[model samples]
Target chain A: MSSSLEQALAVLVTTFHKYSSQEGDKFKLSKGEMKELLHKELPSFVGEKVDEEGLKKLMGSLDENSDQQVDFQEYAVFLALITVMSNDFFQGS
Target chain B: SSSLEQALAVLVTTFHKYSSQEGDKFKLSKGEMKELLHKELPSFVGEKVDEEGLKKLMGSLDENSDQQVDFQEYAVFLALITVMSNDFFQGS
Candidate 1:
């Protein structure tokens, strides 16, 4: 964890498990748990405003396996996509 | 930004700063990329990747598709490396 990348991944895994462990399926994020994570951890992406409909749409898109829960792979997929988007936007300027 | 999410921003913004200075504008020239990794991620990537190894690593990430590494491709690279790092961490 001496590098930013390493620290980034560490934070990601720990943050994910912190919520995933709260309810059913310790290996996945229930919709509620995922919503909390999005709002709390990633508020800059969606803003701090917290919209349920928006969250549902995002969760719908992120639930790749359609189990109504987000697994680590799915979460990683999201981080990848969002990071790319942010990178694109930053380079856009 | 939460500390965790700030890391995500750092991942994105760092790439942007490196990519903006040369080559494709939306991508990094091989040299720029090497400079970025060596300077910003030395602890994880290490300072030991030789020229040939760096070429192969960049080429793999490029997929020979005009030798350009877009942000998407770069993110994929980071994700793979990070996943392996996590695995190594957990295994240890």
Candidate 2:
């Protein structure tokens, strides 16, 4: 069986694809797709009260070159940042 | 929890599992990193890594040249691996 870490890696990839494949540019996540992903898959982090402005800012931050979309590299970097933040919380607890 | 949340949690927990084994507690020593790679990423790292290969990897990962693998560095490693895995899965 694959280790949890291995499974997690697969999950990370699959999850990105789940949203990225929804519309234009099958390999990237448009702002709308990203908003949906954050709301559905990361409710804990985004909360139920996320606003349009908040999501817009978040997407802008992830869209490193102002490409208006998040490719795999950009998405991975975002996940890495989130993982590091989660580690900080894990350590504090 | 959602699968993505679960996956993120796994990433955090797995890093701590090894990072706390010794040294700074928040960072991974060379030995801790080796163990983590061998056990948690058996398929990715292959059966075994030679000393030279391991040294090179550590050098590459130590972006700040701190001689230790911080959570940021480890996260980057995992992110890169995940990207590669995604490519493989997509047959690209």
Candidate 3:
């Protein structure tokens, strides 16, 4: 049996595909795909209230190459950033 | 069965689970990290992480050379693994 942490890592990869495969490249997240991902999978981060500007800014930051889509590497980096933030929040640092 | 949020939460908690075991309550000691990998990532580490391999991994992870793995380092390691998983699934 995989450990909780192993399972969690699997979730991260699978979740990206769950959204990324919805349209277009099928291996990358378009702006709309990313928005839905944030709104649905990370509701706590984006909040219940929709903020068009905030979403736009977030997409801009994640799409490091400005290709208007987020590849897996970009997505991984974003998750790492969030994990770091979550760690810091818990550590009260 | 887990949501992305839940998964992320697990990641955060897993670090603390190991990190708080010894020395520092916020960072993972070498022994703590070894236990974590042995227990939590058997498939990734593959049965054994010999002392040399463990030392090399710690050397790379301890960017600050403080002889421990902090939350940021742990997160980065997971991110690298996730990226590798993504590549495997994408067959690229």
DockQ leader: 2
Ranking by lDDT: 2, 3, 1
Candidate 1 ranges beyond 4 A from true positions: A20-36, A44-57, A63-74, A83-93, B29-35, B49-66, B87-92
Least accurate stretch of 10 residues (summed lDDT) in model 3 chain A?
Answer: A43-52
Query: Which docking category, incorrect, acceptable, medium or high, applies to candidate 3?
Result: medium
- In candidate 3, the residue pairs with backbone N, CA or C atoms under 3 Å apart (3 or more residues apart, or in different chains) clash, namely none
Q: List model 1's recovered fraction of native interface contacts, to 2 decimals.
A: 0.48
- Model 2 clashing residue pairs (backbone): none
Candidate numbers sorted by DockQ from highest down: 2, 3, 1
Recovered fraction of real interface contacts per model: 0.48, 0.71, 0.67
TM-score for candidate 2 (chain B): 0.66
Query: How far does residue B61 in candidate 2 sit from its true spot (Å)?
Result: 5.6
Candidate 2 Cα deviation (angstroms), residue A7: 0.7
Q: Write the per-residue lDDT of candidate 3 for residues A36-57, one digit (tens) a residue.
A: 6765777445432434454556
Better of 2 and 3 by DockQ: 2
Error of 1 at B10 (Å): 0.7
TM-score between candidate 2 and the true structure: 0.70
TM-score of each: 0.63, 0.70, 0.66
Per-residue C-alpha lDDT of model 1 across residues B1-92, encoded as one tens digit per residue: 33766777676677778887866567875556556666776765646643454446655544543455766556656655544445533364
For residue B63, what is the lDDT in candidate 2? 50
